[PDB]
From a paper:
Guanine-rich DNAs can fold into noncanonical DNA structures called G-quadruplexes (G4s). The highly stable G4s can impede many cellular processes such as replication, transcription, and translation, and the failure to resolve G4s results in genome instability. Pif1 helicase binds preferentially to G4 DNA and plays multiple roles in maintaining genome stability, but the mechanism by which Pif1 unfolds G4s is poorly understood. Pif1 helicase plays multiple roles in maintaining genome stability in both the nucleus and mitochondria.
We then went on to crystallize ScPif1 in complex with ADP·AlF4− and T7-AT11 containing a 5′ T7 ssDNA loading site (designated as ScPif1-G4) and determined its structure at a resolution of 3.5 Å. The asymmetric unit of the crystal structure contains two essentially identical ScPif1-G4 complexes. The AT11 portion of the DNA substrate is well ordered in the electron density map and adopts a G4 conformation very similar to that of AT11 alone, indicating that ScPif1 did not disrupt the G4 structure. In the structure of ScPif1-G4, the conformation of ScPif1 is very similar to that of ScPif1 bound to a ssDNA29 except for the 2B domain, which rotates 9° upon G4 binding relative to ssDNA bound ScPif1. ScPif1 recognizes G4 mainly through the wedge region containing α5 and α6 with additional interactions contributed by the β15-β16 loop in the 2B domain. The prominent feature of the ScPif1-G4 interactions is that R324 interacts with G12 in the 5′ most G-tetrad (G9.G12.G15.G19) through cation-π interaction and with T8 (the first nucleotide preceding the 5′ most G-tetrad) through van der Waals contacts, which in turn stacks against G9. Additional interactions involve R326 which contacts the phosphate backbone between G9 and G10 and the base of T11, and R323, which interacts with the phosphate backbone connecting T11 and G12, and L329 and R330, which interact with the base of T11 through van der Waals contacts. Compared with the wedge region, the β15-β16 loop in the 2B domain interacts solely with the peripheral region of the G4 and has no contact with the G-tetrad. In the structure of ScPif1-G4, the Pif1 signature motif not only contacts the regions involved in ssDNA binding but also interacts with the two α-helices in the wedge region predominantly through extensive hydrophobic contacts, thereby stabilizing the wedge region. Our ScPif1-G4 structure showed that the structurally conserved wedge region contacts the ssDNA/G4 junction with R324 playing a key role in mediating the interaction of ScPif1 with G4.
Numbering used by the authors: 236 to 583, 607 to 624, 631 to 765
Write the structure that this text describes.
DNA sequence: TTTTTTTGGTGGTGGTTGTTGTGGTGGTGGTGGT
């Protein structure tokens, strides 16, 4: 049901142009990108379109992965020549760069000039091809009135992308969307945001946002919550978890790394994104933070169903997807776990095991011949035999393709490197974090019809604008600590947008 | 104040980094593995 404007951008891409297209929050940029990818893939081949964004959550929104994950450059910090050498070792990433025909990059506002220039070097060098990006077709999408790249604060609204040599030679074409969809119900709200987008906040606009400080309805819809800093986010996530009914399950990380200063180690540990102490409950909302396979990536959203050991989960999964599931099969595995292990492997202590929440057996429930749910009492027995085995969270993850894949999530390992690649710090922990609340950075690209926003710690230009334009309706938005002095837009972006009509 | 991540050969400034190689479609490495 794409608009006249959206379809012409898709059709322009068919003609082979290297395009950047843009528009205010909620103009339908990502919804259009999703559809565009199908036709680029039909032109180039299923495996030959790189779909990428600046953050994990924004990449998942269009079925892709982070530009960093795609390129194979790690953090991509060093000289272009060093990154290229890292890339050319890894067979997956070198072949990817040689074979792809198109590179899709969403939320481009968060990509700094150095990365584009280095990426240009990499594509030119790998493909033996002096075209702007080795000839890869470029589709760039985002809004530079939103967040700039993440940096600290020497003198760094880091030169944005439009200042990169790679950009000026590569980007052939720009397209601007104008119609705001996200907030379409509320024209006064849309006008307030777009002027807020440009850093032009008047008194009357300020009055209306300060009016939205009233609390949200206590209704069963759990709100999204947005904060500037990870510390704010963790407090909001842990609060919501404590309101959930249920026994807490504690997962303490295993940390290491061959550095003598314990404090220095902890500084490096903070940026691993998986918590030291992961607390989960049945019903907890979680986010995947590691790239495990093709459709389970950083940004995948899920809900904890229960906690089971691998033997129990094999039975749970098979009971799911059952032709009719004669309860005899479950019984064989119950009294003879040696047969469960073989069955499981054919396809490949002092703490009481709490029984499974009855909600996890609801899928079979939606005539006493078939209402004999002995399997529920059979599944509970098999689970009880897991006393003294590790019980992992079963999470229903939802991918960008609308699939609802159930995964019993095992611990993974993280490591960082040096100027070269010696590991400084390493951790083993589940690749999960609570995700009712989101940082404003990772929220960028999301649509949040019920959201609380606390602007108390906003610092970068455009951050306040990003947070409020996630909302759909004013009735579903609360804003705390709005301050107009913290919303001024970057003049370089105002100027750049002047060559656009 | 915030984001970004890692198998194999089209490296060798390292095995303390290989259950990540119980490898070999690599050689400007050798405290690793056969
Ligand atoms: N043509 C359209 N018709 C109806 N709704 C749309 C259309 N385009 C976008 N939307 C809605 O607008 C919201 C934001 O769109 P999105 O593609 O995320 O914009 P952006 O990526 O620019 O923020 C989505 O929830 C989507 O449902
Ligand atoms: F610019 Al957006 F969601 F991608 F507001
Ligand atoms: K090696
Ligand atoms: K060797
Ligand atoms: K080797
Ligand atoms: Mg988008």
């Amino acid at each position: 049901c794409l608009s006249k404007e959206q379809e012409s951008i898709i059709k322009l891409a068919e003609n082979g142009h290297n395009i950047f297209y843009t528009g205010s929050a909620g103009t339908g940029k990502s919804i259009l990108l999703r559809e565009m990818i199908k036709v680029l893939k039909g032109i180039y081949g299923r495996e030959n379109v790189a779909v990428t964004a600046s953050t994990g959550l924004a990449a998942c929104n269009i079925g892709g992965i982070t530009i960093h994950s795609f390129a194979g450059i790690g953090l991509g910090k060093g000289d272009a020549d060093k990154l290229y050498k890292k890339v050319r070792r890894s067979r997956k990433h070198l072949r990817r760069w040689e074979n792809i025909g198109a590179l899709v990059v969403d939320e481009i506002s968060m990509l700094d000039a150095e990365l584009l220039d280095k990426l240009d070097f990499i594509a030119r060098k790998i493909r033996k091809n002096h075209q702007p990006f080795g000839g890869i077709q470029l589709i760039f999408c985002g809004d530079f009135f939103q967040l700039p790249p993440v940096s600290k604060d020497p003198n760094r609204p880091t030169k944005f992308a439009f200042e990169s040599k790679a950009w000026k030679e590569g980007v052939k074409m720009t397209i601007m969307l104008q119609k705001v969809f996200r907030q379409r119900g509320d024209v006064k709200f849309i006008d307030m945001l777009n002027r807020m987008r440009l850093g032009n906040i008047d008194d009357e606009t300020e009055r209306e946002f300060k009016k939205l400080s009233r609390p949200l309805p206590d209704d069963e819809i759990i709100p999204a919550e947005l904060y500037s800093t990870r510390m704010e986010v963790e407090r909001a996530n842990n609060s919501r978890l404590s309101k959930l009914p249920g026994q807490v399950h504690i997962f303490n990380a295993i940390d290491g790394g061959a550095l003598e200063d314990e404090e220095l180690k902890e500084r490096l540990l903070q940026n691993f994104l998986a918590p030291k102490e992961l607390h989960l409950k049945v019903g907890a909302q979680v986010m995947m933070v590691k790239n495990l396979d093709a459709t389970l990536v950083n940004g995948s959203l899920g809900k904890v169903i229960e906690f089971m050991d691998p033997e129990t989960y094999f039975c749970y999964e098979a009971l799911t997807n059952d032709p009719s599931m004669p309860p005899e099969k479950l019984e064989t595995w119950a009294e003879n776990p040696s047969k469960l292990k073989a069955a499981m492997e054919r396809e490949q202590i002092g703490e009481p095991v709490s029984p499974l929440d009855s909600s996890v057996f609801d899928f079979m429930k939606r005539v006493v011949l078939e209402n004999i749910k002995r399997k529920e009492q059979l599944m509970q027995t098999i689970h009880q035999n897991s006393a003294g085995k590790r019980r992992l969270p079963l999470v229903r993850f939802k991918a960008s393709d609308m699939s609802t894949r159930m995964v019993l999530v095992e611990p993974e390992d993280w490591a960082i490197e040096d100027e070269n690649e010696k590991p400084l710090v390493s951790r083993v922990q589940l690749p999960l974090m609570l995700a009712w609340s989101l940082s404003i950075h990772k929220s960028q690209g999301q649509t949040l019809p019920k959201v609380k926003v606390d602007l108390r710690r906003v610092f970068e230009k455009g951050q306040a604008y990003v947070a409020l334009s996630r909302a759909v309706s004013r009735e579903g938005l609360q804003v705390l600590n709005f301050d107009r002095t913290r919303i001024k837009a970057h003049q370089k972006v105002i100027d750049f947008y002047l060559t656009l009509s």
